[model samples]
Target: GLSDGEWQQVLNVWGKVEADIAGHGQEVLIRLFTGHPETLEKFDKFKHLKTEAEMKASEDLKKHGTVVLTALGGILKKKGHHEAELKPLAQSHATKHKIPIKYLEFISDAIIHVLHSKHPGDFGADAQGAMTKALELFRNDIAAKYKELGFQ
Candidate 1:
């Protein structure tokens, strides 16, 4: 894998991307996340989740926007979930869930888009990773947010 500096570069780039897209704040984040669809595995006509349910618990490090990947966590997608953490929501769960200070922050921004969108880029696409146009599509539909950055 790459070294610390290389990893830091990824963070820097992602941070900028977050700022560029999220600059409009939670409203924008809401749009992006909701712009995507919630796979049926995420609670459908057949199943449901309680508020106290632990969610998407991971066994490894807490990187990106992922939260609550642990023994009691529940699911986030059609596949599965791992753990939880101190998300941008400014709320902190499991004080010990700290596998890292800032690893999975990506999940938050991604979640925003996931929660709001419909058909979130044509079937099974997200679980495998978004198509190349995903980001561009976001850039295009993002209402006046990207114009400041020229997002190309």
Candidate 2:
């Protein structure tokens, strides 16, 4: 569970970058792709975004990245209590996009990486731990539906 200070840090830090949701979102995706190159296999259209600059150049990437960040923002705005807010979207990603819950977990970690990278010292150990806890809860909630669908 997140302490009040941890929760406030999450909100405050995210607020600083909320205006550039698309940019941060793209960074998260690019970081994931770069760190785990094979993850690109999951995205039919994004296989070519080998670099952050390439991702920036793609309008589709920007749009989809914004969508991803906005979903995250929705959960954050609800103070991380609305874990259900992410379930339907996660289900759509699984059923419609053929994406697995694990991919969603990867994206969750990528967002945490973004916070650590972009905010530097501000996203210190305490903040990281809290955010990780918050996101793990959210991810588990979203992914549990997929598991019940018989995904391993």
Candidate 3:
């Protein structure tokens, strides 16, 4: 049973990510970003992104991984997403099958933060632009594609 604040936390994070992704609505394949060569050097292994999705989910946090992982756990306390990972540790051996799906959304949000830290050009779409594109993906191949890309 999630409290009201708990639900709001998940929704706020979810909304932010969704809004960011939607802003990249104009061209899904083409990114209209303007930055310097040095910044490009800091980009993923390729230096520059080959696709929008690739840029959106890149993160290289050596020191902050622990903090990120812990926050992810707090969000997942809702008991959805990777229940398999944490459920085995549940105190009750009788905690057998399905628990309620409270949806651990901050997992997805922390994912976005990491992505942005790695590449400020996350989504290759500005805040407004990503929002539009995210809407398209939402009604269409959003989840399936993100899943294939190992997003969620």
Candidate 4:
């Protein structure tokens, strides 16, 4: 569970991030792919993109980024108390998509990195820790679903 102070920290940065969801989302994915190139192989559309410039120019990647962020925004809007809602999505990723839990962990890092890069003034150490804890909660919830579905 997120403490009230931690939730405030997350919401503060999220205000800025929500303002440009597509742009920030795209940056998050780009940073993820850049830092962990192997993660790109999970996406058939993105796997062929061999260069950063090419990734930047990808409409599919951009669209997916927006989609991913939109979903995340919805979850956060509920203050992350939506495990029932998240279970199906988690099941899809674990069973149908066969996505590794580690990828979620990687994306969590990517999101924090992008937030810090974009909002240096607002995203201080405390906020970073709050965001990290929030995302870790999300990851752990999904991991639990994966385990329940026998996918891990």
Q: List the residue pairs that clash in candidate 4.
A: none
Root-mean-square deviation per candidate: 17.7, 2.2, 16.1, 1.2
lDDT of each: 0.28, 0.76, 0.35, 0.87
lDDT of 2 by residue, 1-152 (tens): 56788778777767856878888977887877887787787788888666767876888887878888787778876765784687777667777777766776787888887887887887778767777877887777776777777664
Stretches of candidate 1 exceeding 4 Å from the true structure: 18-28, 31-91, 94-152
Better of 1 and 2 by TM-score: 2
Residue-level lDDT of model 4, residues 1-152, one tens digit each, is 89898988888878888899888989999999999998888788788999999989988888999899888877777777877768878988987778899899999999988987887787788989988988988898898888888886
Pairs in clash, predicted candidate 2: none
The candidate 4 region of ten consecutive residues with least summed lDDT is 76-85
What would the per-residue lDDT of candidate 1 be over residues 46-143, giving only the tens digit for each residue?
A: 12322212122211112222222211112212111111311211222113222121222333445335433532443243332332232223222332
Could you tell which candidate, 2 or 3, scores higher by lDDT? 2
Q: Which residue runs of candidate 2 sit more than 4 Å off their true CA positions?
A: 1-3, 50-52
